Amino acid sequence: GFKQDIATIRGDLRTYAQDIFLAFLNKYPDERRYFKNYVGKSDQELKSMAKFGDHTEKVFNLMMEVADRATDCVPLASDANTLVQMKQHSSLTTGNFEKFFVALVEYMRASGQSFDSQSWDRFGKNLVSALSSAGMK
Numbered sequence: 194g195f196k197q198d199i200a201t202i203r204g205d206l207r208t209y210a211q212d213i214f215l216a217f218l219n220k221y222p223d224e225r226r227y228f229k230n231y232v233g234k235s236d237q238e239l240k241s242m243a244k245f246g247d248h249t250e251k252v253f254n255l256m257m258e259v260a261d262r263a264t265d266c267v268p269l270a271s272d273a274n275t276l277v278q279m280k281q282h283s284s285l286t287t288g289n290f291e292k293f294f295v296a297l298v299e300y301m302r303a304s305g306q307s308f309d310s311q312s313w314d315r316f317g318k319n320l321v322s323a324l325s326s327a328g329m330k
């Protein structure tokens with residue numbers, strides 16, 4: 194289930210973080226504009242820029258903390274608030290996050306593994322609701 198998925202992802206966090214982030218960018222290429230240093234780089238090229246592996250790992254660490262603190266895939270309003278108020282997220286809207294979670298859920302479905310894809314889809318929906326409830330446009 195969802196708790197085990199947190200454990201699976203944490204066990205190899207940099208690998209899943211890179212793969213899922215790349216799946217997002219490659220599914221939604223317009224989103225790469227927000228990540229100036231990644232423009233014009235292939236998957237394997239990104240995998241040698243220090244900021245890439247370090248940024249993606251930090252993003253997924255936070256996402257796992259938010260997931261772990263959730264109750265029945267509903268995140269804490271304080272964790273939504275943190276994500277809205279981050280300087281790095283100031284120009285984002287909820288659609289950016291919707292896209293991210295579409296890519297994440299698609300990744301999990303395509304994986305050979307028994308990820309609880311439906312729980313991640315619900316978590317993403319509830320996080321987007323919570324971002325909106327916290328004032329994200």
Ligand code: HEM
Nearest residue numbers: 224227228247248251252253255256281282285289290293
């Ligand atoms: C639940 C989803 C997300 C989480 C948990 C998350 C978390 C974070 C964290 C922890 C950082 C700081 C990384 C660092 O300084 O090393 C970060 C930076 C950033 N986030 Fe997010 N974020 C998420 C979704 C998004 C989405 C959907 C976008 C854009 C489409 C985005 C755009 C950025 C940008 C532009 C930065 C700064 C530049 C960079 O880190 O490469 N984030 N985010």
